[PDB]
Amino acid sequence: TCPFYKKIPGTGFTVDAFQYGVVEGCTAYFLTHFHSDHYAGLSKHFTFPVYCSEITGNLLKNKLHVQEQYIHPLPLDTECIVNGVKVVLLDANHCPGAVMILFYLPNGTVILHTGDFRADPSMERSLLADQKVHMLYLDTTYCSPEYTFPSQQEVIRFAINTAFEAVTLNPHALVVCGTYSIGKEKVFLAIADVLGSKVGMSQEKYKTLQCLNIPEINSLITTDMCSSLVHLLPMMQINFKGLQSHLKKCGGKYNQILAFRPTGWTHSNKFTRIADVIPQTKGNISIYGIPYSEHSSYLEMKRFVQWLKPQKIIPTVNVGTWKSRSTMEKYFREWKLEAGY
Numbered sequence: 001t002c003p004f005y006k007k008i009p010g011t012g013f014t015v016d017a018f019q020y021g022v023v024e025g026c027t028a029y030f031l032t033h034f035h036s037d038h039y040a041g042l043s044k045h046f047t048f049p050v051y052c053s054e055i056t057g058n059l060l061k062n063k064l065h066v067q068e069q070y071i072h073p074l075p076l077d078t079e080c081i082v083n084g085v086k087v088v089l090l091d092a093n094h095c096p097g098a099v100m101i102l103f104y105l106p107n108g109t110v111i112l113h114t115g116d117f118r119a120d121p122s123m124e125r126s127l128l129a130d131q132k133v134h135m136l137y138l139d140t141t142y143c144s145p146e147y148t149f150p151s152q153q154e155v156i157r158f159a160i161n162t163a164f165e166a167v168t169l170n171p172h173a174l175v176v177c178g179t180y181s182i183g184k185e186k187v188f189l190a191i192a193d194v195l196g197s198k199v200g201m202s203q204e205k206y207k208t209l210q211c212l213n214i215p216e217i218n219s220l221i222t223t224d225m226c227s228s229l230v231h232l233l234p235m236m237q238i239n240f241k242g243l244q245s246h247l248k249k250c251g252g253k254y255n256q257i258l259a260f261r262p263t264g265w266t267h268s269n270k271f272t273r274i275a276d277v278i279p280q281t282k283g284n285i286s287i288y289g290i291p292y293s294e295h296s297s298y299l300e301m302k303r304f305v306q307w308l309k310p311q312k313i314i315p316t317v318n319v320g321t322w323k324s325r326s327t328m329e330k331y332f333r334e335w336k337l338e339a340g341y
């Protein structure tokens, strides 16, 4: 049955709640972003209103075949009225088309649902700064102090310099990047840009990327693998077996693979600096795991919440164990006592 943390009190609304069948008394279904744990249950047979960003609405129509008449795309940073309730969509700094939702309840409560997000100081200068928020439904994916990672910029710098060095030393090396959902496009696009190549990929992934309003995208991507030296493959294929196989398929155009696996967190982060990351190598195949995150680190999350000073926090991630739930609640209390709210 729909969990309470997917329900907006004082409304008929749910958030990212498409796998429960008909939610009793739900009059509008919001979808924060096009990731499968969040959209699970949507299809062409869905007949209730879905509210989302334009980008998410492009993916609903073209990838899942949801009928146009049930898709209600909203512009960002704009006050809109949904079943008589004022809402605002904000950028979540997650994947393309990912939003946070501000709800202005008839009774005067203000609720922010972060969806999935990577907190950033730039958020402290959106429409959020203009009023107080009573309840925060928070993406707590990495809500423990061991979760530190570098800025997205430092990670991309590492990958561009790595790839450029390797292909300059060996003009017959192939670069491969893994993916399993939208997000992290900067990894492969930045690498192709410094090499003067387009990124080659399957037809289904090219279609997905064409839904995202990325500027000049027809200049960066292609379904012709032969004319490309940066290839995008399913994340599952980013291993020595999968890559040896792929290399065979290129028919002696290439003799070396350099592959990147943008992961979430990995425990080398507590110890290792980005400067200090090394690949795993077998034969003429090297694999780099790089900590390119689109969720908040512990410290980024803490800053955001201490800035916003909500009255009540409802976690949306890691809620399934008592030890997790209890630990998070302890961090929220420290944050509030340290900051004085």
Ligand code: NI
Pocket (backbone or CB within 6 Å): 033, 035, 094, 116
């Ligand atoms: Ni997500």
